[PDB]
Design a binder for this molecule. Structure first.
Ligand code: BCL
Ligand code: BCL
Ligand code: BCL
Ligand code: BCL
Ligand SMILES: CC[C@H]1c2cc3[nH]c4c(c3C)C(=O)[C@H](C(=O)OC)c4c3nc(cc4[nH]c(cc(n2)[C@@H]1C)c(C(C)=O)c4C)[C@@H](C)[C@@H]3CCC(=O)OC/C=C(\C)CCC[C@@H](C)CCC[C@@H](C)CCCC(C)C
Ligand SMILES: CC[C@H]1c2cc3[nH]c4c(c3C)C(=O)[C@H](C(=O)OC)c4c3nc(cc4[nH]c(cc(n2)[C@@H]1C)c(C(C)=O)c4C)[C@@H](C)[C@@H]3CCC(=O)OC/C=C(\C)CCC[C@H](C)CCC[C@H](C)CCCC(C)C
Ligand SMILES: COC1=C(OC)C(=O)C(C/C=C(\C)CC/C=C(\C)CC/C=C(\C)CC/C=C(\C)CC/C=C(\C)CC/C=C(\C)CC/C=C(\C)CC/C=C(\C)CC/C=C(\C)CCC=C(C)C)=C(C)C1=O
Ligand code: HEM
Ligand SMILES: CCCCCCCCCCCC[N+](C)(C)[O-]
Ligand SMILES: CCCCCCCCCCCC[N+](C)(C)[O-]
Ligand SMILES: [Cl-]
Ligand SMILES: [Fe+2]
Lengths: 281, 124, 246, 267
């Protein structure tokens, strides 16, 4: 159950806790102290969700929704059947995520590779925690987070959005999206370039990293190189998620009116706010 | 004629992403428990921006009702084609604002919905 | 009689996706498969996905071909022994892992030749042999000493190897105490205003570092030999790593 | 003759050849930019001050629904829109063609041409196919910063909350995936760059310790893994699948499905 070159790598060590105690594998997966942890949280949350499935009265994975503690509840607790569960689950989740990340750290150590991977992943977690912790905490209530339901979480987005008109107008929201689209483009382009250099016209030698840079340049006008393209994807992707957390952390905490009104500042500048004509005059 | 209700009903659907129709009993005549906008039950003949439950009326909507607006076919149709504009003209204020981020393009659609409104959302 | 176009489309699409998934996966089985046991013999339980049909890569510069998937190359004794008779357990080094090249200090039996750029010239050259490459990057590392995680010095920077194509420094030639010199992976050394810190290797393991036959060019095989050794130090040169690392 | 094509073929902007199409591309491009631009100024009242303050408010709207699909619409009410679009059309397709030929010229695979093709499918659907199938250019996207964002919102509301569109979701799934995947591959590569990993093509033809550690990192983390090559076969599909599925979903809107919420409750 190993790769024809996995061997020489499966040496002992690299852990962060427990030492050689949990330092082993279960088939393809590596366990480590945080492997059992991730499994713990994972399973606990899985259960609690199913419990909520029963309390709710259905096993259809398209109806099962775990709603948080009603607004009134504030930041205190709540009955298991009335938000309590959502809270604990949201605990197992945070945990399972942070575990899943630390487990990566042990694997990065054993292989003598970089730490960029979990480092990035952390961003997803901040983003998450932003929606289910920070934002609600700043706004003063758990009820402000989103439900854990396949479709019931989309409605949350819908509603939460129209709660401020056409969310589009959110400056931060604009940037993020911008990053999301560019990343997609960037990722597409990247793959395409390598595959096209590795799989050239029938009967030709693979292309050279130079044919690669001469092509990419003839599209953008600049040469960013290999180390550069990857450092840009990681950059583009992380940014998007970052400008997203920012995008929300301000919505309802410092901004309350419809995002479209925010742009008035630009229009209302003294030197032109009162000039007749145009659209806003 | 001049407003097919059964046609307006299908139309109103798209309104359901923000509106809902519920009588004073608490029963749904149309809607998905959407609260982004006000309950349209009784909108007919009602004064603009006076629905007791809705707490998100814009300044234009409130001020336009206080000036004497009570939704009748004529004005209703002008509203769903471009709220903000409508609210500006009728309000007389060039800096008025509407919160209904939606525009019903077909003028016919409006007349059909209004009919549906007359058939299902008129508080006796 | 008619059909719901949308739902037919959504349905079709899924059939498609699965197929793509299968395609992708199998395609990603040219390197590493078939799977062997901790023993060295086939696992027989390769999985649901089958190996793909062989394809041949015509390498440039006349380096030859490459047909994948194909016979497993890996030819070099693995200085590691089981730790238990139960599958799924580590394999501890018999001798010196850093030297025997295992775990975090492993290397691959890559072609024994230097990487060539688009024209056919080496990709990496010692700057003091480059075609007009100056040190405008900022701080000149040439000259300054080179110490290990033990804080003891082990030599000085003699020259910077540059990646002519991508135009970026990739190696640091540091002369040792016995006249000879060694190569260091830039990423594994921090350049300070007064010295070079190699938190990866100990001031004594600066010799174990593999050498490059040609004193003006390093072949791919040699890079794997080096880097792997250096990076592996992190894990194995920990007993001699002086705390308070920055 | 060929002499002229040979002249053009060498068009450049420094160390890069612009090719024949490349000229038609850029030229047609500026004409597009020029078309929208002129209009904006007309709407600004030729006053630079007003232009700069309402720059995101200007919108070159498409013809009215009454004008159907004819090009009879007067300039200040639909004409400029068509003209602009006409340029953006030639602009884009030229560029696609350039990307293709330039790959053939270097003797490479036509992947980039294909990838780009998926993005064009979405563009193509929004401003051309769907309007034609719907029967009018009024169903088209207007040129303007704020204006097209307004479009989008309305488009959704009109068709019963796109969220409930399977193809909208499928798409979004891939949009997120793309971030995720590139976020991974990017970090991963960097993580093994010390082993000269960024040099993927050479790792493709001559596996290095880098292409092993990576493959091993994930195999231990998630149970499976890619190959220095294949990962990119993921990267490409992962991305192209955004506009693809994407395109489809928009095309089905209005033409086949009226309200996605409802269509969702029945399925
Ligand atoms: C259906 C989806 C909507 C749409 C929804 C959005 C949203 C939502 C946003 C944008 C934003 C942008 N859109 Mg748009 N956009 C649409 C179609 C288009 C078309 C087109 C087909 O011709 C173009 C050229 C643009 C261009 C743009 C850019 C000006 C800006 C950043 C995108 C980016 O990262 O580009 C990278 C490419 C090169 C660097 N959009 C369609 C109609 N667009 C962002 C912005 O700031 O808008 C004001 C933004 O938030
Ligand atoms: C009508 C609705 C509004 C609107 C309302 C909102 C609201 C409300 C929000 C957004 C948010 C977002 N919007 Mg919006 N949005 C609108 C229209 C758009 C349009 C468009 C074409 O018009 C676009 C492109 C976007 C784009 C976006 C994204 C930039 C952003 C999502 C953050 C993210 O991806 O985190 C991705 C990553 C995470 C969320 C991390 C969590 C993942 C965890 C860490 C890992 C999961 C592990 C898992 C459980 C294990 C699985 C099981 C195993 C497989 C076995 N919106 C309209 C106008 N939008 C969100 C935002 O800003 O978020 C910060 C947000 O809250
Ligand atoms: C800020 C952005 C919003 C948001 C906005 C949207 C929108 C808009 C859409 C989704 C959609 C989806 N969302 Mg969401 N979503 C948010 C946060 C989450 C979180 C989380 C822990 O934070 C999770 C697990 C999900 C999960 C999902 C998937 C079920 C679905 C499509 C997969 C996808 O896009 O994968 C990207 C990642 C991958 C492809 C990698 C593999 C990940 C797998 C696919 C995730 C498994 C999720 C699983 C079913 C639930 C696990 C439960 C545990 C087993 C107990 N969302 C936040 C609140 N989400 C789409 C849908 O169809 O909704 C109905 C959709 O259109
Ligand atoms: C209220 C609004 C609705 C909504 C309505 C719509 C509509 C309507 C659409 C989407 C579409 C999309 N939505 Mg949505 N969407 C909503 C909420 C969301 C949320 C969220 C968390 O809330 C998310 C994550 C998304 C995500 C997405 C993306 C998956 C998808 C766009 C792909 C793309 O960017 O292609 C970007 C790439 C292109 C458009 C390619 C075309 C580019 C051409 C080829 C090149 C132009 C060159 C040019 C001339 C140069 C100009 C330079 C610029 C000026 C800078 N939506 C809400 C519920 N959404 C789109 C979709 O499904 O598309 C298929 C779509 O049509
Ligand atoms: C810059 C941020 C981007 C990013 C990066 C990223 N994601 C990552 C990584 C990185 C760098 C990993 O290394 C890690 C990975 O291993 O790759 C597959 C991962 C990963 N990203 C994942 C998902 C994911 N990433 C997403 C987004 C993003 N990831 C961003 C775009 C999304 C979204 C919202 O689009 C999703 C769904 C996982 C597949 C994987 C991490 C696996 C993991 O954490 O497992 C932990 C444990 C379980 C399997 C059990 C969870 C059970 C319960 C504890 C919780 C569930 C309840 C509730 C919280 C969810 C309910 C969902 C409802 C909303 C429907
Ligand atoms: C899977 C789809 C993703 C994608 C892929 C993609 N885009 C691409 C390509 C690919 C594979 C190219 O090969 C091509 C390119 O050459 O870029 C470097 C391109 C491209 N994507 C572009 C834009 C673009 N792509 C976008 C999105 C996406 N592209 C998707 C996320 C977006 C959005 C809406 O987010 C935009 C605005 C162009 C910059 C470029 C194609 C160039 C072009 O059409 O030029 C015609 C016009 C001019 C020369 C006029 C310019 C106007 C004046 C400034 C002069
Ligand atoms: C050059 O390097 C690289 C590699 O090596 C060659 C790699 O493999 C990878 C890894 C990537 C892939 C194998 C591609 C497929 C993976 C995705 C598109 C990401 C989404 C993930 C999933 C659907 C699976 C999630 C499963 C998990 C977390 C395990 C849970 C367990 C169940 C038993 C990357 C990024 C890389 O860059
Ligand atoms: C669907 C085509 C639709 C109709 C019809 C409609 C009507 C409508 C009326 C008559 C009012 C005024 C009510 C009163 O004075 O009591 C009104 C107000 C708001 N609407 Fe609406 N509306 C329709 C659709 C939508 C949609 C899709 C949304 C959300 C994007 C929406 C929102 C709102 C809001 C908000 C208001 C209050 C506005 C204010 O106070 O300025 N409507 N709508
Ligand atoms: C000088 C003004 C520049 C304005 C450029 C406006 C870009 C808005 C593009 C969105 C419209 C897209 N399209 C093709 C679908 O119509
Ligand atoms: C090529 C990468 C594989 C990506 C697999 C992603 C599956 C996500 C599916 C989301 C479910 C969407 N929906 C609405 C159609 O059910
Ligand atoms: Cl191919
Ligand atoms: Fe790559």
């Amino acid at each position: 159950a190993l790769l024809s070159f996995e061997r020489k790598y499966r040496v002992p060590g690299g852990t962060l806790v427990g030492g050689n105690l949990f330092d082993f594998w279960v088939g393809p997966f590596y366990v480590g102290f945080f492997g059992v942890a991730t499994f713990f949280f994972a399973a606990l949350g899985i259960i609690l969700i199913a419990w909520s499935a029963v309390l709710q009265g259905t096993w259809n994975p398209q109806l099962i929704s775990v709603y948080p503690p009603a607004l009134e509840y504030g930041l205190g607790g709540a009955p298991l059947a009335k938000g309590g569960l959502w809270q604990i689950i949201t605990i197992c989740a945070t945990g399972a995520f942070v575990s899943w990340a630390l487990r990566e750290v042990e694997i990065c150590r054993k292989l003598g590779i970089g730490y960029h991977i979990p480092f990035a992943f952390a961003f997803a977690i901040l983003a998450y925690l932003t929606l289910v912790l920070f934002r609600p905490v700043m706004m003063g209530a758990w009820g402000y987070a989103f439900p854990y339901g396949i479709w019931t979480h989309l409605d949350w987005v819908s509603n939460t959005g129209y709660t401020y008109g056409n969310f589009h107008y959110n400056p931060a929201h604009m940037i993020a999206i911008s990053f999301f689209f560019t990343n997609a483009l960037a990722l597409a382009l990247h793959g395409a370039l390598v595959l096209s250099a590795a799989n050239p016209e029938k009967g030709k030698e693979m292309r050279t990293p130079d044919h690669e840079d001469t092509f990419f340049r003839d599209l953008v006008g600049y040469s960013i190189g290999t180390l550069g393209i990857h450092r840009l994807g990681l950059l583009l992707s992380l940014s998007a998620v970052f400008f997203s957390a920012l995008c929300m952390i301000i919505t309802g905490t410092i901004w309350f009116d419809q995002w479209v009104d925010w742009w008035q500042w630009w229009v209302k500048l003294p030197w032109w706010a009162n000039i007749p004509g145009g659209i806003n005059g | 004629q001049e407003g097919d209700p059964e046609a307006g009903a299908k139309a109103f659907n798209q309104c359901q992403t923000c509106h809902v129709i519920v009588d004073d009993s608490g029963t749904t005549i149309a809607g998905r428990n959407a609260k982004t906008g006000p309950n349209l039950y009784g909108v007919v003949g009602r004064t603009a921006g006076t629905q007791a439950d809705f707490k998100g009326y814009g300044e234009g909507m409130k001020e336009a009702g206080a000036k004497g607006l009570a939704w009748d076919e004529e004005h209703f149709v002008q509203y769903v084609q471009d709220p903000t504009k409508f609210l500006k003209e009728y309000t007389g204020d060039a800096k008025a604002k509407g919160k209904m981020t939606f525009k019903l393009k077909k003028e016919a659609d409006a007349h059909n919905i209004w009919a549906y409104l007359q058939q299902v959302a008129v508080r006796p | 009689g008619n059909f719901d176009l949308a739902s037919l489309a959504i349905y079709s699409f899924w059939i498609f996706l699965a197929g793509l998934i299968y395609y992708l996966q199998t395609e990603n089985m040219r390197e590493g498969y078939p799977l062997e046991n901790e023993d060295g013999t086939p696992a027989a339980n390769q999985g649901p996905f089958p190996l793909p049909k062989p394809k041949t890569f015509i390498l440039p510069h006349g380096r030859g071909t490459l047909t994948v998937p194909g016979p497993e190359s890996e030819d070099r004794p693995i200085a590691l022994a089981r730790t238990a008779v139960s599958e799924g357990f580590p394999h501890a080094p018999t001798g010196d892992p850093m030297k025997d090249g295992v775990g975090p200090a492993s290397w691959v039996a890559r072609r024994d030749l230097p990487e060539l750029d688009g024209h056919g010239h080496n990709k990496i050259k010692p700057m003091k042999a480059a075609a007009g490459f100056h040190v405008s990057a900022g701080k000149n590392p040439i000259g300054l000493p080179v110490r290990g995680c033990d804080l003891e010095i082990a030599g000085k920077v003699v020259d910077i190897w540059v990646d002519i194509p991508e135009q970026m420094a990739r190696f640091l030639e540091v002369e040792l105490k016995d006249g000879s010199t060694r190569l260091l992976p830039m990423q594994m050394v921090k350049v300070q205003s007064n010295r070079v810190h190699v938190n990866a290797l100990s001031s004594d393991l600066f010799a174990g570092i593999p050498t490059i036959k040609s004193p003006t060019e390093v072949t791919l095989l040699e890079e794997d030999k080096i880097c792997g050794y250096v990076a592996g130090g992190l894990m194995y040169a920990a007993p001699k790593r002086k705390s308070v690392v920055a | 003759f060929s002499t002229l094509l040979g002249w053009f073929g060498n068009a450049q902007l420094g160390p890069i050849y612009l090719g024949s199409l490349g000229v038609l591309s850029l030229f047609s491009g500026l004409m597009w930019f020029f078309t929208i631009g002129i209009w904006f100024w007309y709407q600004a009242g030729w006053n630079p001050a007003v232009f700069l303050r309402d720059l995101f408010f200007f919108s070159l709207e498409p013809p009215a629904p009454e004008y159907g699909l004819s090009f009879a619409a007067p300039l200040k009410e639909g004409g400029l829109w068509l003209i602009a679009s006409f340029f953006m059309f030639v602009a884009v397709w030229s560029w696609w063609g350039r990307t293709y030929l330039r790959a053939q010229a270097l003797g490479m695979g036509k992947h980039t041409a294909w990838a780009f093709l998926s993005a064009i499918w979405l563009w193509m659907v929004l401003g051309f196919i769907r309007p034609i199938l719907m029967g009018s250019w009024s169903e088209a996207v207007p040129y303007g910063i704020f204006s097209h964002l307004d479009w989008t919102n309305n488009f959704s509301l009109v068709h019963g909350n796109l969220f409930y569109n399977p193809f909208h979701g499928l798409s979004i799934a891939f949009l997120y995936g793309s971030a995720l995947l590139f976020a991974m591959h990017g970090a991963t590569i960097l993580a093994v760059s010390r082993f000269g990993g960024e040099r993927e093509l050479e790792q493709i033809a001559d596996r290095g310790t880098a292409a092993e550690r990576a493959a091993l990192f994930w195999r231990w983390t998630m149970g499976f893994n890619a190959t220095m090559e294949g990962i990119h076969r993921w990267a490409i599909w992962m991305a192209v699948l955004v506009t693809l599925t994407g395109g489809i979903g928009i095309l089905l809107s209005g033409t086949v499905v009226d309200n996605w919420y409802v269509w969702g409750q029945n399925h």
